[PDB]
Amino acid sequence: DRGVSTFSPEGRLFQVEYSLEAIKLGSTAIGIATKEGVVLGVEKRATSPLLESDSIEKIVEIDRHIGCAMSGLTADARSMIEHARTAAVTHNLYYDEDINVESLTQSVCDLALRFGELMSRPFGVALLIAGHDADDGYQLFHAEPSGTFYRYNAKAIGSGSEGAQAELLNEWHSSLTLKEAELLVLKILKQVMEEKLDENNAQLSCITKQDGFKIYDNEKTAELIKELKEKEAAE
Amino acid sequence: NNYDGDTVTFSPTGRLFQVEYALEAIKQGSVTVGLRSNTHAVLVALKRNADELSSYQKKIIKCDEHMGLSLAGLAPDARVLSNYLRQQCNYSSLVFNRKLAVERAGHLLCDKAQKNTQSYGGRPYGVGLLIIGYDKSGAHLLEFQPSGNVTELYGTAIGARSQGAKTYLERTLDTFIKIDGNPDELIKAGVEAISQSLRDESLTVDNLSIAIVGKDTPFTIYDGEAVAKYI
Amino acid sequence: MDIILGIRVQDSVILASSKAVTRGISVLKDSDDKTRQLSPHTLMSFAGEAGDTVQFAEYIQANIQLYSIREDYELSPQAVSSFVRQELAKSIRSRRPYQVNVLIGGYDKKKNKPELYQIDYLGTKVELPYGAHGYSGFYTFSLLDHHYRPDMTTEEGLDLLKLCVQELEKRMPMDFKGVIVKIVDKDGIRQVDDF
Amino acid sequence: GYDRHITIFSPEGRLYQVEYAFKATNQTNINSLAVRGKDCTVVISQKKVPDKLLDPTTVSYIFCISRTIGMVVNGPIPDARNAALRAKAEAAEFRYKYGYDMPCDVLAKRMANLSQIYTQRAYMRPLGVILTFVSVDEELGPSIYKTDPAGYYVGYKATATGPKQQEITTNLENHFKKSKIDHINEESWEKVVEFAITHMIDALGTEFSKNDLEVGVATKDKFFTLSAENIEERLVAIAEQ
Amino acid sequence: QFNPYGDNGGTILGIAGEDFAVLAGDTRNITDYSINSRYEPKVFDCGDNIVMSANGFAADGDALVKRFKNSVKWYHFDHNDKKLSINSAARNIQHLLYGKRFFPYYVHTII
Amino acid sequence: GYDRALSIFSPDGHIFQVEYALEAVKRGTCAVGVKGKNCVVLGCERRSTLKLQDTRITPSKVSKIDSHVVLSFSGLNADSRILIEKARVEAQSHRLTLEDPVTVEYLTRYVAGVQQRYTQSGGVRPFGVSTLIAGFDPRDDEPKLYQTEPSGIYSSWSAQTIGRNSKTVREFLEKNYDRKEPPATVEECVKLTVRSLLEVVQTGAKNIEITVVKPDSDIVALSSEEINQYVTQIEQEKQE
Amino acid sequence: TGYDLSNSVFSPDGRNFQVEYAVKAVENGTTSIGIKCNDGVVFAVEKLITSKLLVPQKNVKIQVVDRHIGCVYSGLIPDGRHLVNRGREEAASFKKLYKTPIPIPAFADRLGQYVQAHTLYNSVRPFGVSTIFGGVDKNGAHLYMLEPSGSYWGYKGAATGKGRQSAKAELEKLVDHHPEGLSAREAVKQAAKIIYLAHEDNKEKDFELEISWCSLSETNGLHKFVKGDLLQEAIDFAQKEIN
Amino acid sequence: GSRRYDSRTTIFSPEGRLYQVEYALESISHAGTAIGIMASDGIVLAAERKVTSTLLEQDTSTEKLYKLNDKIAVAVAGLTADAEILINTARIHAQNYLKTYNEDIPVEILVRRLSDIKQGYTQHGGLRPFGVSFIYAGYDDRYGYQLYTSNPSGNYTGWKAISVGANTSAAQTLLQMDYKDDMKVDDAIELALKTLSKTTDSSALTYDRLEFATIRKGANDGEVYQKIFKPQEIKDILVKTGIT
Amino acid sequence: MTDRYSFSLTTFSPSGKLGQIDYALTAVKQGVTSLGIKATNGVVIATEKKSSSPLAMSETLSKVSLLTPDIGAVYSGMGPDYRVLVDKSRKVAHTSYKRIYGEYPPTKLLVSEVAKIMQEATQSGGVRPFGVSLLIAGHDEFNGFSLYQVDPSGSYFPWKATAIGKGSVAAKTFLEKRWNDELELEDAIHIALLTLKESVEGEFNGDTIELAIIGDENPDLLGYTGIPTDKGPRFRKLTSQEINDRLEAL
Ligand SMILES: [Cl-]
């Protein structure tokens, strides 16, 4: 065989590149950042109809001001979320304040390359980290198993990412309202999803300065889905 | 071929392929330039984005009030090495009340990178660094390679198409070395140097990254509207 | 803490434990239950150093409950007492020993016999017809030595116990705020509410 | 066939790494010889200094392990010096722990045990050396004990090691058939050294100058090496007879 | 038996106004009945508009200030040059002090 | 200590050791879980190539983790004991610190976490086991049924099956289980569970085990005759 | 085969191919030399000027150990630094316990045993440097050369790197023409000449000369770098001889 | 590094099998047959010694049957050296339980712990598994007489009658034929010997190639006795059933 | 650095063989012949002293070793492996028995400890099995005289008489014809010498043969007097002269 921390001739780490292929097989997750808030949405993708879809937890709270969506080997994300929550709470204990979204993301990304012959392999999951702080306002970050993170105005990850990202390139502008962003996530999810989008197989969430991180009810999302279908038929 | 499975293996011609593959990661990285006069030292870096919706990856990192570097290659490896430099600079201050010499900073990075090239299990660092600083012997510029080799220079560049800026600085050597007591002109020379490595893209306001340190100037980084002056 | 008593009669084991928790010159509580059910037919009362007592009792309780789940079977009172003794025997040569004394009352369902074990903080175990810890025995034993018979009923055991509490309430210096009484027999563990 | 890379058994019950360590023994192309007198033990070895830029005084394969024990090595110098440093440390520790000087045969056994471990444990390679230990033991008298990369060791009446070892071995065998005894019946160590050099000359068929040889001598309470002039004095005595 | 603590004397004083705050301290340093220095400052500017003094055993005082100044430096490195607010500094100093709960810094700290 | 990374990524982005552990689960005897309006039923297959067995002492397929939660599995039997032991220890540890028994979701989350840890720890292979975890939360009458697998993912199910020929019995459950109206009684829930196993098993003799869990720590295992009555009743209705 | 894929494996010859492969890395490096003289030693090295942008005199390659030992090497420069760092630790512990500064032969074996240890296991790589080193102690002057295998000897003169054969030939002439001995100041001049003559095997890029020395009379038994007037004087002597 | 030489003893095949466990079972299938039969009033353990030599000391020998405590014994099939490591561990475990609870260890608890040790060697540590299969025969006051088996996988099961080692397929068919539930010890003794006699790879079954043991309540009143048969006692029981 | 070989080097092959153990047994087969015979009042163990060179002093190399005063050992296979096993065997007799019970271990238990050491080299990380088979003869109060064989796998068997190594197949057949349960110790020594002559090719005398017995107590070899219960070692190595005396009446 070969070392886990081996470089390829092109100057990339084999294991990190292979984990990126696992993330492409994962379910779609989309995030959009506005001046009124950040929206996070995911495809649940139940493997069977007997599976109770509400138990599928792919959007997750880290703190009141920070939320998180995932895509890939979702089991790998548990210890990442655990670390993120501890980092957020620990900082509040040491400094009597909220921790910056960027500093949280950096803390999570420090775990990424702690593998070799430390854990035995990289994480096989990508994260979208969305939050708010007083200094830099509403933010969205894409955290990869390479240990790298980019800030985004909008970002899609998962199986339908490259098609959804191209759609986000055209639709995003710096004056989007929160409601406009909500509909946009639903619209783009419906386009890349295999099965027909409804309140049971898709989930929305947002983070605002005022109310913090909230996962939407199935009743609330259902009305936004109905509002979306009516607006597309109206021209 | 059969001798590139790990860093502990020599090839029949005496080469370390894992170290060479790590060197290759730097070549894929975005271009960054370093140059100095007798009074100041300047870093200029071209930042890279994922797409139009993404931010531009930050290339420059501060290590102390009098020292800092720019990166090209694996960014997390730069974070580890810069953190180590922050600690070593800090140890020097707390224990000896002494600012760490830029030369010692280079020696310490060399030795840390070397240990990762002689033992089983580990891997070489996959990043190159340009360290600038001002200490008791004036301005300094260093080039770090993950083979362990550290080199002191008047000017240099690393990353993709770095040969263009490196040739330019080799011609301009006599001019920019004597830009003493004039920060803006030394930066202008650095911005003109990195321009020789551009293809199809030009320097914009959220694309360019500049840093400076000198006689009466702490290590500071300029981004955004603060670099509009130099376009 | 302070007063814990135990009496083994024909068909049951009766444990009586004081209700007072005192700290300094203040009685902080007068309804404290100084006991833990280890298994359906095994009860342990305890007294000693503050904090240590409940920490030890609950630790033993967790271990016996774990055993019960693993084997789908209830350990005999003799087996539970031996486990507890060993834990205290380990403790006495530790950096900081558990300063806890216990009585273990149980009904062995295989033998159809009640059993009472007295174990001090050193890990000194004895099976007895009647038992006590601390200064309590200095008053009650002479009373039990006289009035106790091996063939007594549960009701006769309760009357014998009333006699002991009355003697303690007369001659003891401290107000221990009465006792909670619990019976262990073939049908399990139950509490006498009016004592 | 990874059974030839580490010290595990091959299908025919062999350890190839041990066998290849034996071949490293002759990499220096040097022959050594050891004999016993009445009062002493002499060891001689060839000294080849090819490069003119070398300091010849630093080129040596004989080592003073303790005051009483000497050691000559057949094999590459890095492994030789590794063995020498360990032997010196072992001999010193023995004296501290047990209150008397470590015997030659006991040190040989200890170093042989260490070698055995490298043939059984995978992470450690065998040393490509053969170690010949010499002394005048206070109980057993003149002693020669030799160690190899297999972990084998035994005492010797006399011995030889190197590429042309067999020629030297039979030459010594034929002498002891004739003399009918276990040693060189000689009073002084000087003449025992002369015997050693004489029989090496006959077996190898080469002449020696003062710089072509290296000599170590063990007597009661000290082992020492000879200088070039001490050897030259010895070469003159042989020539004048 | 070796006594790891000493008393370097001196006194400090902090008052807060509407849009300002003062932290004062005398410059005398003593041991027993002797004067070590007539001018040895023990009120320090720690950056981010925070002034600090740790009065009592001077060795512990200097150690604490040195560690807090260092804490401010790393706060900038780890959190994008964010300004350390006075309330955040206070909480951070609590953890510095309580970290030696069983071998305390023998000082009275005011910021 | 033995350090080797055994679970690693392949070029196509798969972790083969985790996927091969799923093949061990596919080899195991079939297990099924069905939850009704007021109960959960766990059914388990037992292969009949083993006669001369002693069923008194042979390890049962369904294990109590606490008095209110049960765990069944499909895959390597030896591997399952390690998970069951850890689960039982955590159940008692939870009671000790929180002063309340575990929820079914929490217990599942713990077991699934252990399984995940063995997919990115050096020197270990993944568990060749998938589990069905069922029960009722303290002071709650809503039935709970969860599933875990070697990768570490877990989820809630109205009804689910695992093991060999599980795709056949899942097919049966998908058309016979109504979400709008789950089995209203204990009898209805057991019958649907037995029916689903009869699609795969062979004979309804000593091949099927059934365990019923009701609220407030009410768990009981059915005997041969009791199960055989369900088998006899189903076959007579079938001939139509 | 496959015997050369792992360190510490004997080939059927009785060779360690990994060590021989490390020697190839040494042969690839720049030329460095050592000259033993009357009461001390002299070290010199070739520094290839890759670019105009290199600051002259500010990429120092010769290293001091303790205050009386100088070290220079050819091959992988980082590996050499690792060896010197160890040498400094070894010298420090010797002086700590025994008070006196470490003798040169004692120091030589400390490096030797350490380099040899990196040929015993497959979990480490052999050193990719040959190290020329020495100094002055109680018994006078000593010059040594250490190789990847851990093999070292004492030398009258030593050379390693890409121009080793040229340098060796020039060294042998000095030994023959000066049997009584060479002086310290002469050895500095000769060192310059030999580096310039050895530069013919690396003549694409022009180079920078660097010399150091230890002498009982000239440097009081301590290691010092040759700079200024004495350096320029040595350069001029070398320039006159090539023409 | 050392990665090159690692056999990876604790991995799955593409089919989801553990290579080393399967290969250890293949090793055990060449070992001398051992049979256990459980009766209502006792248990029989019978085992065939591996091809004996006439100069082997038969009376002072132990290869197949080992005593764990006064109430529990095991029959071995596989590598003897591996079995003795596990036997000593099991003996210690039984004494730990007795020390802790002042009661003799229940049979299943001892079997589970020994089986858990085997399991560990298949999941972690990178070591080869133990090439051993046990038949456990024992008594406790909960379940009475019990027969168990464990194998290198660390999986264990309970039995009325079972065989391990060589020719288990043929042996199990014969046991399945003649076994019934109301059987007595003396009948079980006869079944065990008859089964070995038909499944043996030898020409004829003799006293010197056998080890035999019973666990009865045939002591005096409500107590269990372990009888490891002497050579002469095996010779007599072989004549009494008419095999020789 | 550090021992990275934390995994087994001996593993099961598809056919169920443990390769390294089999190959270790092959190394034992190549080794020089050694044997052991048990008599009514003693035990004898013998082997050939294969000299590596005539210049070598074969007295300094001992193939037959004392483990305890009443137990001795001989081997066939790799000599160095045997030497370290004797060191470990001597120590374990003290650490795990004599320092606990104040008396030397019985033969069967010391054999059991040596077997354990050899089994661990078959399963532990980064090691090969021992390339030797041992024959251990001994006496103890409650078991009397006994003879055991220990193989590379860690298996051990008790023997009335046996042989191991080069010509073990023929030697075992020879011993079967001659052995009875009424053999006196002197008769067993005689048979041992006869059996060994068949496998030896060159010189056959007291200098090329190594032979020791486990017999009566030897008070003269104890080194002190005054304690009645201490009566001396039962292990005795026969001298070169004592062997030649028995080779005349052969
Ligand atoms: Cl030893």
Give B95's contacts in chain E (Cβ within 8 Å).
none
Which CATH number do you get for residue I228? 3.60.20.10
Q: With the CA atoms of G160, G166, G169 and G172 taken in that order, what torsion angle do they form, in degrees rounded to the nearest 10?
A: -50
Report how many helices (DSSP H) and strands (DSSP E) chain G contains, helices first.
6, 10
**Element housing D70 (H / E):** strand D70-74
CA–CA distance, A183 with I40 (Å, rounded to integer) = 100
User: Are the C-beta atoms of B141 and B36 separated by less than 8 Å?
Assistant: yes
Interchain contact, A78 vs F156, CB within 8 Å = no
**Number of C-beta neighbours around residue F5 at 10 A:** 24
CA–CA distance, I107 with I89 (Å, rounded to integer) = 12
Domain count for chain D: 1
Q: How far is B136 from chain G (nearest CA, A)?
A: 15
∠ CA C168-C169-C171 to the nearest 5 degrees? 60
Q: How far is I210 from chain H (nearest CA, A)?
A: 23
Q: Which of H67, H36, H94 is nearest to H225 (CA)?
A: H67
Q: Range of A192's domain? A: 1-235
Q: How far is C127 from chain H (nearest CA, A)?
A: 14
Establish if E80 touches chain A: CB-CB under 8 angstroms: yes
For B29-63, letters b (16+ CB in 10 Å) and e give: bbbbbbbbbebbbbbbbbbbbbeebbbbbebbbbb
Q: State in Å: Cα I88 to ligand 1 middle.
A: 9
Establish if H124 touches chain A: CB-CB under 8 angstroms: no
DSSP I17: -
CA–CA distance, F1 with H20 (Å, rounded to integer) = 20
Establish if A6 touches chain H: CB-CB under 8 angstroms: no
User: CATH classification of G1-243 is 3.60.20.10, yes or no?
Assistant: yes
CA–CA distance, B208 with B222 (Å, rounded to integer) = 9
Token pair listed for F154: 């877990």
Q: Range of I100's domain? A: 1-250
Helix (H), strand (E), coil (C) string for chain C? CCCEEEEECCCCEEEEEECCEEECCEEEECCCCCEEEEECCEEEEEEECCCHHHHHHHHHHHHHHHHHHHHCCCCCHHHHHHHHHHHHHHHCCCCCCCCEEEEEEEEECCCCEEEEEEECCCCCEEECCEEEECCCHHHHHHHHHHHCCCCCCHHHHHHHHHHHHHHHHHHCCCCCCCEEEEEEECCEEEEECCC
User: Are the C-beta atoms of F60 and F81 separated by less than 8 Å?
Assistant: no
Interchain contact, E92 vs A95, CB within 8 Å = yes
Task: Pinpoint the alpha helices (H) of chain B.
Answer: 17-28, 75-96, 102-115, 162-176, 183-194
Using the Cα atoms of residue D23, residue D25, residue D29 and residue D32 in order, give the sign of their dihedral.
negative
Q: Which of I10, I50, I52 is nearest to I32 (CA)?
A: I50
- 3+ Cβ–Cβ pairs closer than 8 Å linking D and E: no
User: Are the C-beta atoms of H93 and H111 separated by less than 8 Å?
Assistant: no
Q: Considering CB atoms only, which of C71, C73, C79 is closest to H102?
A: C79
| Residues around the ion ligand 1 (C-beta < 5 A) | D 113
Domain count for chain B: 1
R_g (Cα) of chain H, nearest Å? 18
- Minimal-distance CA residue of chain F relative to A123: F120
Start-to-end CA span in chain F (Å): 65
Return phi, psi of residue I210, to 5°: -115, 130
User: Are the C-beta atoms of C159 and C144 separated by less than 8 Å?
Assistant: no
Q: Considering CB atoms only, which of D21, D81, D124 is closest to G10?
A: D21
- Which residue of the set G30, G131, G160, G219 is catalytic? G30
Which CATH number do you get for residue B136? 3.60.20.10
Interchain contact, E70 vs B86, CB within 8 Å = no
Start-to-end CA span in chain D (Å): 58
Q: How far is G177 from chain D (nearest CA, A)?
A: 13
Interchain contact, H8 vs F56, CB within 8 Å = no
Which CATH number do you get for residue A195? 3.60.20.10
Q: Range of B89's domain? A: 1-231
Give I125's contacts in chain F (Cβ within 8 Å).
2
Token pair listed for D30: 């040097």
Establish if H180 touches chain A: CB-CB under 8 angstroms: no
DSSP D126: P
Q: Which of G113, G171, G166 is nearest to G143 (CA)?
A: G171
Interface of A with F (CB under 8 A): 4, 15, 18-25, 48-52, 54-56, 73-76, 78-79, 115-117, 119-124
Resolution of this deposited model, Å: 2.6
Q: Considering CB atoms only, which of I8, I119, I153 is closest to H127?
A: I8
User: Are the C-beta atoms of I46 and I97 separated by less than 8 Å?
Assistant: no
DSSP I94: I
Establish if E37 touches chain A: CB-CB under 8 angstroms: no
Interchain contact, I7 vs H54, CB within 8 Å = no
Q: Range of C69's domain? A: 1-195
Q: Considering CB atoms only, which of H102, H106, H141 is closest to C78?
A: H102
Q: How far is G64 from chain I (nearest CA, A)?
A: 28
Q: HSE on the CB side for B91, CA within 13 Å?
A: 10
Token pair listed for G240: 């006159």
Q: State in Å: Cα I82 to ligand 1 middle.
A: 13
Q: Which domains does chain H have, with CATH numbers?
A: 1-244 (3.60.20.10)
Give D123's contacts in chain G (Cβ within 8 Å).
121-123
Q: Range of D209's domain? A: 1-241
Interchain contact, F24 vs H16, CB within 8 Å = yes
Chain H, chain I: beta-carbon pairs less than 8 Å apart = 107
CA I246 to chain centroid, in Å, comes to 22
Q: State in Å: Cα D17 to ligand 1 middle.
A: 22
Domain count for chain A: 1
Token pair listed for C76: 């005999």
Write down the CATH number for the domain with range F1-240.
3.60.20.10
Q: Which of H175, H166, H173 is nearest to H200 (CA)?
A: H166
**Strand ranges (E), chain H:** 34-39, 42-48, 65-67, 72-78, 132-140, 144-150, 156-159, 161-164, 210-216, 225-228
CA–CA distance, D129 with G120 (Å, rounded to integer) = 14
Interface of C with H (CB under 8 A): 71, 73, 75-76, 78-79, 82-83, 86, 110
Q: Which of I101, I176, I114, I192 is nearest to I140 (CA)?
A: I101
Start-to-end CA span in chain E (Å): 35
Give the largest Cα separation in chain A, rounded: 60
G119 catalytic? Reply is: no
User: Are the C-beta atoms of H211 and H65 separated by less than 8 Å?
Assistant: yes
Q: Which of C40, C72, H110, H143 is nearest to F64 (CA)?
A: C72
Name the residue ranges covered by the structural domains of chain G: 1-243
Q: State in Å: Cα H85 to ligand 1 middle.
A: 26
Interchain contact, H57 vs I38, CB within 8 Å = yes
Residues in chain G: 243
Name the residue ranges covered by the structural domains of chain F: 1-240
Return phi, psi of residue G71, to 5°: -135, 135
Q: Considering CB atoms only, which of C71, C82, C110 is closest to H102?
A: C82
**Element housing G146 (H / E):** strand G140-146
Q: State in Å: Cα G101 to ligand 1 middle.
A: 35
Token pair listed for G180: 């009584």
Q: State in Å: Cα D116 to ligand 1 middle.
A: 10
Domain count for chain I: 1
Give A3's contacts in chain H (Cβ within 8 Å).
3
CA distances from C24 to C18, C27, C55 (A): 17, 8, 21
User: Are the C-beta atoms of F83 and F114 separated by less than 8 Å?
Assistant: yes
Helices F104-117 and A77-95 sit at what angle, rounded to 10 degrees?
110
Establish if C153 touches chain F: CB-CB under 8 angstroms: no
Q: How far is G115 from chain H (nearest CA, A)?
A: 18
